[PDB]
Design a protein around this ligand. Structure first.
Ligand SMILES: Nc1ncnc2c1ncn2[C@@H]1O[C@H](COP(=O)(O)OP(=O)(O)O)[C@@H](O)[C@H]1O
Ligand SMILES: Nc1ncnc2c1ncn2[C@@H]1O[C@H](COP(=O)(O)OP(=O)(O)O)[C@@H](O)[C@H]1O
Ligand SMILES: [Mg+2]
Ligand SMILES: [Mg+2]
Lengths: 116, 538, 528
């Protein structure tokens, strides 16, 4: 097992990426983190989203480059590995999104990426 | 010296929640009291002048009815002797269909008089043997009391007259209309073959127009809507399928394996072409109506709409089988076009709206067919349910008449004559069993007494007049409920008659239940468990 | 009683028997009637009911008010049931049924209290109801001329009478004209689903319109939609049930290739499949494309490039109404898009109605459907306007089925009461009191009209009785002039079947309630 345990705060969700090479983690401070299983280095930490993240979803058709994160900011915001930026965000949710399902993705309100 | 300890032996060995009742006073009298109380609860609904009862079960479901079996079913009866009595009533309902209240009243009277006999000094075994002897004598007498017979069943007027009495106890105000309806429905059924099936009579309940607007339909009525665009067919050629209206798939696992671009571009087009070919092959046989038991695919629906085919989807397989019986078709297992023998024909299939509900009607025109449907109107769901129970009683009476055609006078005439002759027989029998025989005879008085009490007259005067008239030699004289004072009249002219089988089975079952209750001497009840129903009942 | 160490029924079983329980049942029916009593007449008032979730319902409809009331009394549920029955079979008079049934029960409560046998009361009710129904059928005014103008006038008057008790009574003539026009364009079954009811917030009642065609809200446009033209002058409409998307060919489909050439061929094949569907739709000649299944952004841009209009995820009923208006056919496959299966409307346009975008299909000459667009200041306002229009539509449909009318305002019931009293004065006498009680109970509706209007009910009832006795059939309450008038000449018309069903249902409910002598309530299971 990886059992890395490099984390100052607790882990709301530790979602293993679809690519069998790296893991995606989000701490209790609302910042997501990407770790390489082989090397162990933290590739990049995602700022913003001040309240703690609560769900992590990678892209379903492999494509280990984009993911969506939601937490207590009542936000549904999408990232990108190749730039480390919030490429897309949503505002419909208003209460501490618990779990998110990737279809577009349904979170608890079905969002569509092609039309925002 | 301030406490009474439990006696050594069985009293101490009993479990914490168990109960033990032993001996006459502790067991037999308590059982008789419970059965008498149950009979008292169900008594007031007896006869045409019986009063409806609103019974609410544990699921807050209303039941307004004067049917004894339904009332007992919806009652949470807990006393086990009353449980035997209820089981006897339900067995009577299953075997015949009418006479449950008679079973209750007779069992209660028998147990009351058995308690009296036990008090005066007789033993339980002597009472039991006297009751059995009197039951045998009553069964011997009963055939001699038959007044008339059905003598025909394909007619409408006299069948309605026969069925009037059965559905006169319930819906006393308007029984001629219901008698005509049920007679028509039953005469449509019951072909040249002597076998009559109760399930071939269907009841459809549509709300809104009052029960006077109810009708009988030679066909089947479904509260559904057409899947396609066609909503009316005049010369239906229904083809029934038990499979979903879609291209069948492999039962193991389906995986469309694509290896070239041409296969990818042609797969969906070929599947659609196959669907179109199958639908057109079905239509080419002339089948303008298709009934399926599964889901309907979008492409199949489109191609059916293209060829003007009426689609009906029936979820229940019982409904599918009943429709196959009604129209005369065979439920094909695959989506192949039907051969000429497997294609059913109905003279009219169309979509209609009765009141509010949308219905699909498979309507014949001949005064025949395998299945007939009675559409029931009304202003309340409970009222329509009560009318449905009355229709069920009438259909069961017709089935009994098909089984045995003999009839006996009603309104207590048969009961009074039986009581008189059983008393006459018991007056000649020596020994201690004469008391039990006489009490068994007297127990028959509870039927005319209940009828008089419900009608609102003095029961004793009616019973005395009935004895006087029967002593004069009139065996067909019973209570006249169309009077404000105690009066009697001949019931053969009035047409108030009861089936011989109903009386026979009711007497037999009531006597059996009474003697079975009397046989119990000790009761050992376990602690009432809190389990969520036995696993047998799911 | 006695403890009876082992008991018969389960503990907690509550039973009530005898005269007191019947009196309590009558009182419960009176309580139910009181809750809808003030909603009857042109001077009737609305009731507001709030559920547990906090949503408020405002309605003048008796059936709706009774349904929102959560009645648990076994005898009182019968009044709600007969109100639902009247709503289902007729659609109007759901207050009259409850008032009549409760008044019957109240009138016979005294006779119950001296111990009269309930069967006698039931028989008297049955006889009185049969006589009243026969009298209604006999004296109902019908016109056997088949005049289209006269039929339209009769339908409009019936709709106005059915509408002159709601909040839209100020625009009752205008709404009745809409309702008659909408109903007359249904083909043969007068299906309710073929009349669209769209509620758009904002605007006055006079801003509400009836569309001789079909209209529906814009449905989640994709990117590139705003480049599509929003008005056509002779469009051909393609009604489809097709998902125009780049997606997997099938759920169980799986592609296995071992060469990059085959990879590119597969990608181009998917693109070519989508473009073939789009090209077939385009070459069909259609300009407006509607689909029940989603239409993707690629298809939206493709149609925008061709100056075409697309709208996916259209509701099924809206597609059916578009079929019945334009005259096409919904196609699950685009392989055969002939001119037969293409809809046609004179003008298609997208406009803004109160901060919402709506698509319009007007100019249809052979339309078999309609679309009501209702305007109001609140959602409950539009909901109650829809309820009133539903009442009017049901009344107009029933009038189309049979144009047998009787004067309103209680005139018909005063005539029935006079006839029933005249009949009761010529019978032995035990039934005479009950039939007279039935006739007196028939007077509740005009008295309730007077009470709601602030009248003096006694004087108006006396004048009505005298006028009916001395000659005159259609004399009822004149709400505006504080007096009575010939309501037939005042065009206060109702279909005869409305009163027939009301009397039948009320009598059946009263007989069922009276016939019950014992009520048994089993202990609740799984209280949780
Ligand atoms: N018109 C009538 N006049 C007098 N007695 C009648 C009449 N119709 C039916 N009965 C009597 O009512 C009894 C039927 O009671 P019912 O309520 O049907 O109980 P069950 O369903 O247990 O037979 C029959 O025994 C019959 O003698
Ligand atoms: N213009 C009018 N003048 C007098 N009475 C009217 C008028 N319009 C309707 N009514 C009366 O209102 C009664 C029905 O009230 P309403 O609330 O419209 O329907 P519902 O019976 O469904 O509540 C009818 O009995 C009718 O006689
Ligand atoms: Mg019976
Ligand atoms: Mg009205």
């Amino acid at each position: 097992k990886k059992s890395v345990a490099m984390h100052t705060n607790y882990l709301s969700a530790c979602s293993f990426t679809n690519s069998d090479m790296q893991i995606l983690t989000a701490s209790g401070d609302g910042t997501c983190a990407l770790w390489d299983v082989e090397s162990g280095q933290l590739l990049q930490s995602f700022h913003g989203h001040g309240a703690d993240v609560l769900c992590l979803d990678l892209a379903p058709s492999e494509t280990g480059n984009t993911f969506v994160s939601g937490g207590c900011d009542k936000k549904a915001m999408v990232w990108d590995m190749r730039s480390g930026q919030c490429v897309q965000a949503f505002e419909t949710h208003e209460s501490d999104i618990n779990s998110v399902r990737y279809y577009a993705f349904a979170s608890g309100r079905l969002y569509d990426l092609r039309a925002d | 010296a301030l406490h009474v300890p439990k006696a050594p032996g069985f009293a101490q060995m009993l479990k914490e929640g168990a109960k033990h009742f032993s001996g006459l006073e502790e067991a037999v009298y308590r059982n008789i009291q419970a059965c008498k109380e149950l009979a008292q609860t169900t008594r007031t609904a007896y006869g045409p002048n019986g009063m409806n009862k609103m019974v609410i079960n544990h699921l807050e479901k209303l039941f307004v009815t004067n049917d004894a079996a339904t009332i007992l079913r919806e009652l949470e009866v807990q006393h086990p002797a009353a449980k035997m009595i209820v089981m006897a009533s339900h067995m009577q309902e299953q075997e015949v269909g009418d006479g449950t209240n008679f079973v209750l009243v007779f069992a209660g009277a028998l147990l009351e008089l058995a308690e009296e006999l036990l008090r005066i000094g007789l033993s339980v075994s002597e009472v039991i043997e006297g009751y059995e002897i009197a039951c045998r004598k009553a069964h011997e007498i009963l055939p001699n009391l038959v007044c008339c017979s059905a003598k025909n069943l394909r007619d409408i007027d006299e069948v309605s007259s026969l069925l009037r009495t059965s559905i006169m106890s319930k819906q006393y105000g308007n029984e001629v209309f219901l008698a005509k309806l049920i007679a028509q429905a039953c005469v449509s059924i019951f072909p040249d073959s002597g076998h009559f099936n109760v399930d071939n009579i269907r009841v459809c309940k549509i709300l809104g127009s009052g029960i006077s607007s109810s009708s009988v339909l030679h066909g089947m009525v479904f509260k559904k809507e057409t899947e396609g665009d066609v909503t009316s067919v005049k010369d239906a050629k229904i083809a029934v399928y038990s499979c979903p209206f879609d291209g069948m798939i492999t039962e193991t696992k389906g995986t469309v394996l694509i290896k070239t671009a041409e296969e990818l571009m042609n797969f969906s087009k070929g599947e659609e072409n196959l669907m179109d070919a199958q639908v057109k092959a079905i239509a080419d046989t002339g089948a303008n109506v298709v009934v399926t038991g599964g889901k309907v695919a979008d492409m199949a629906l489109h191609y059916a709409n293209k060829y003007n085919i009426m689609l009906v989807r029936l979820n229940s397989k019982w409904d599918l089988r009943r429709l196959c019986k009604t129209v005369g078709a065979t439920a094909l297992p695959r989506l192949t076009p039907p051969v000429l023998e497997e294609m059913g024909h109905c003279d009219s299939v169309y979509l209609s709206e009765v009141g509010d509900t949308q219905v699909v009607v498979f309507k014949h025109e001949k005064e025949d067919g395998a299945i007939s449907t009675i559409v029931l109107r009304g202003s309340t769901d409970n009222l329509m349910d009560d009318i449905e129970r009355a229709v069920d009683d009438g259909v069961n009476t017709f089935k009994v008449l098909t089984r045995d055609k003999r009839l006996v006078p009603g309104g207590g005439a048969t009961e009074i004559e039986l009581a008189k002759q059983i008393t006459s027989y018991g007056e000649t029998c020596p020994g201690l069993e004469q008391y039990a025989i006489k009490k068994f005879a007297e127990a028959f008085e509870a039927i005319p007494r209940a009828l008089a009490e419900n009608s609102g007259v003095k029961a004793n005067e009616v019973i005395s007049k009935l004895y006087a008239v029967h002593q004069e030699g009139n065996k067909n004289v019973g209570l006249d409920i169309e009077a404000e004072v105690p009066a009697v009249k001949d019931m053969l002219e009035a047409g108030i008659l009861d089936t011989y089988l109903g009386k026979y089975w009711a007497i037999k079952l009531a006597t059996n239940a009474a003697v079975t209750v009397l046989r119990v001497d000790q009761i050992i009840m376990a602690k009432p468990a809190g389990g969520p129903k036995p696993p047998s009942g799911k | 009683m006695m403890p009876t160490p082992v008991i018969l029924l389960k503990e907690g079983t509550d039973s009530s028997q005898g005269i007191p329980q019947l009196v309590s049942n009558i009182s419960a029916c009176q309580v139910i009637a009181e809750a809808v009593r003030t909603t009857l007449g042109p001077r009737g008032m609305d009731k507001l009911i709030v559920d547990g979730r906090g949503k408020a319902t405002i309605s003048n409809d008796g059936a709706t008010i009774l349904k929102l009331l959560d009645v648990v009394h076994p005898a009182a549920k019968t009044l709600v049931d007969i109100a639902k029955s009247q709503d289902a079979e007729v659609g109007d008079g759901t207050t009259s049924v409850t008032l009549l049934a409760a008044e019957f029960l109240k009138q016979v409560k005294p006779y119950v209290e001296e111990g009269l046998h309930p069967q006698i009361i039931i028989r008297a009710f049955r006889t009185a109801t049969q006589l009243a129904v026969n009298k209604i059928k006999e004296i109902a005014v019908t016109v056997k001329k088949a005049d289209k103008v006269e039929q339209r006038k009769l339908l409009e008057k019936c709709a106005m009478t059915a509408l002159s008790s709601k909040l839209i009574s100020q625009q009752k003539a205008f709404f009745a004209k809409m309702v008659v026009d909408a109903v007359m364009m249904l083909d043969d079954l007068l299906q309710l689903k073929m009349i669209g009811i769209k509620k758009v917030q904002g605007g006055a009642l006079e801003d509400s319109q009836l569309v001789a065609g079909v209209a529906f809200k814009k449905t989640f446009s994709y990117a590139g939609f705003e480049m599509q033209p929003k008005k056509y002058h002779n469009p051909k409409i393609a009604l489809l049930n097709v998902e125009l998307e780049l997606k997997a060919e099938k759920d169980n489909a799986e592609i296995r290739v071992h060469t990059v050439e085959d990879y590119q061929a597969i990608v181009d094949a998917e693109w070519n499949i989508l473009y073939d569907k789009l090209e077939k739709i385009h070459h069909s000649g259609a300009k407006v494309v509607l689909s029940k299944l989603p239409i993707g952004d690629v298809a939206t841009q493709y149609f925008a490039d061709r100056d075409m209009f697309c709208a996916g995820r259209v509701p099924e009923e809206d597609l059916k109404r578009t079929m019945m208006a334009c005259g096409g056919s919904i196609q699950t496959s685009v392989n055969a898009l002939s001119a037969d299966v293409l809809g046609r409307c004179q003008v298609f346009e997208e406009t803004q109605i109160g901060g919402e975008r709506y698509n319009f299909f007007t100019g249809c000459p052979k339309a078999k459907t309609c679309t009501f667009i209702l305007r109001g200041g609140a959602e409950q306002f539009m909901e109650e306007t829809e309820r009133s229009l539903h009442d009017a539509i049901m009344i107009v449909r029933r009038a189309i089925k049979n144009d047998s009318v009787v004067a309103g305002g209680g005139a018909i019931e005063m005539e029935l009461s006079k006839y029933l009293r005249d009949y009761s004065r010529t019978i032995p006498g035990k039934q005479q009191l009950l039939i007279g009680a039935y006739a007196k109970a028939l007077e509740i509706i005009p008295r309730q009209l007077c009470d709601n209007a602030g009248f003096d009910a006694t004087n108006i009832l006396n004048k009505l009785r005298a006028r009916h006795a001395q000659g005159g059939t259609w004399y009822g309450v004149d709400i505006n002039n504080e007096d009575i008038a010939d309501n037939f000449e005042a065009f206060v018309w109702e279909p005869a079947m409305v009163r027939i069903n009301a009397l039948t249902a009320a009598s059946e409910a009263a007989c069922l309630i009276v016939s019950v002598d014992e009520t048994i309530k089993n202990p609740r299971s799984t209280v949780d």
